[PDB]
Amino acid sequence: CDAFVGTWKLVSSENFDDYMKEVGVGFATRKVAGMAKPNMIISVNGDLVTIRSESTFKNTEISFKLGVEFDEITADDRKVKSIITLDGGALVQVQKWDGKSTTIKRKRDGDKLVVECVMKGVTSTRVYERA
Amino acid sequence: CDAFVGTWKLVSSENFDDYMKEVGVGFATRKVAGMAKPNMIISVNGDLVTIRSESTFKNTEISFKLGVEFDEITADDRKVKSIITLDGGALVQVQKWDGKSTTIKRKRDGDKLVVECVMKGVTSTRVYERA
Numbered sequence: 001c002d003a004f005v006g007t008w009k010l011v012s013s014e015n016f017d018d019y020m021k022e023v024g025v026g027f028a029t030r031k032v033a034g035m036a037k038p039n040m041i042i043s044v045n046g047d048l049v050t051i052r053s054e055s056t057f058k059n060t061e062i063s064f065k066l067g068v069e070f071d072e073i074t075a076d077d078r079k080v081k082s083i084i085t086l087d088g089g090a091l092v093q094v095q096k097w098d099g100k101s102t103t104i105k106r107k108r109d110g111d112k113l114v115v116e117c118v119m120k121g122v123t124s125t126r127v128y129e130r131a
Numbered sequence: 132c133d134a135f136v137g138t139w140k141l142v143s144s145e146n147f148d149d150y151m152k153e154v155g156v157g158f159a160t161r162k163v164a165g166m167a168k169p170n171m172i173i174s175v176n177g178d179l180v181t182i183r184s185e186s187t188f189k190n191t192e193i194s195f196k197l198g199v200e201f202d203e204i205t206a207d208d209r210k211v212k213s214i215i216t217l218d219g220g221a222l223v224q225v226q227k228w229d230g231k232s233t234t235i236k237r238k239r240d241g242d243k244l245v246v247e248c249v250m251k252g253v254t255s256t257r258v259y260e261r262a
């Protein structure tokens with residue numbers, strides 16, 4: 001995942017609040033999340049990939065091996081089971097919790113890193129550029 | 132309600148999608164509603180006040196006597212019981228349906244007409260100016 005390594009800054013967001021609505025995130029949390037312009041930091045050490053999201057009010061970090069299911073506490077505090085695989089040059093993440101699931105794809109588009117989140121038909125697209 | 136009579140055009144909206152989310156409006160309907168820039172038309176004939184909302188995809192109209200509960204079919208198709216009273220120079224509407232309720236206040240602010248909608252703590256503010 002060499003094409004993903006680096007620090008990325010959010011440049012645009014589309015339908016993110018609707019996605020969080022669908023995920024079940026509370027109003028207050030949605031408002032904070034929407035004000036935040038996080039920096040995504042991706043690094044690789046051996047077979048362990050680390051994705052870190054930093055924002056003034058909440059930093060999240062997940063370290064994982066591609067293909068191995070792991071426990072993740074999301075920014076909105078959901079305890080989920082996540083699995084991330086490398087498919088077609090994109091990092092495809094599936095989070096499962098309480099019989100529900102959502103997919104988060106991180107892919108390269110030109111010189112940008114695009115993150116697409118899908119929850120029951122609702123799709124959010126967030127574009128990042130290198131910091 | 133002479134200060135309300137006229138045709139008004141939407142100039143700004145705040146937290147409207149969040150309000151509709153709280154009300155339980157579906158994703159598709161929320162998207163259409165958000166694209167719309169309706170014209171509000173208020174008129175009075177005797178003791179009957181008529182509030183009409185016009186938009187490319189949905190026109191709504193309610194005629195009522197201040198203080199008398201009536202049936203209303205909302206734009207998002209809810210069948211509610213509405214009561215509108217004149218309090219402090221503002222038109223205060225309460226809609227009740229399935230054990231729930233929401234308040235919609237229409238008031239004058241300077242040369243503008245402000246509509247505030249409240250649903251379980253979530254407040255939306257839409258400002259209109261004369262057309």
Ligand SMILES: CCCCCCCCCCCCCCCC(=O)O
Pocket residue numbers: 020025029030032033057058074075076115117126
């Ligand atoms: C105290 C609030 C902190 C922020 C809370 C955010 C709540 C929503 C979390 C959604 C996580 C999945 C979306 C990630 C989007 C991205 O990678 O840019």
Ligand SMILES: CCCCCCCCCCCCCCCC(=O)O
Pocket residue numbers: 151156160161163164188189205206207246248257
């Ligand atoms: C086919 C879709 C048409 C539009 C559907 C709108 C759905 C939400 C209706 C909310 C009604 C109460 C808010 C009124 C706001 C205002 O007076 O400007």
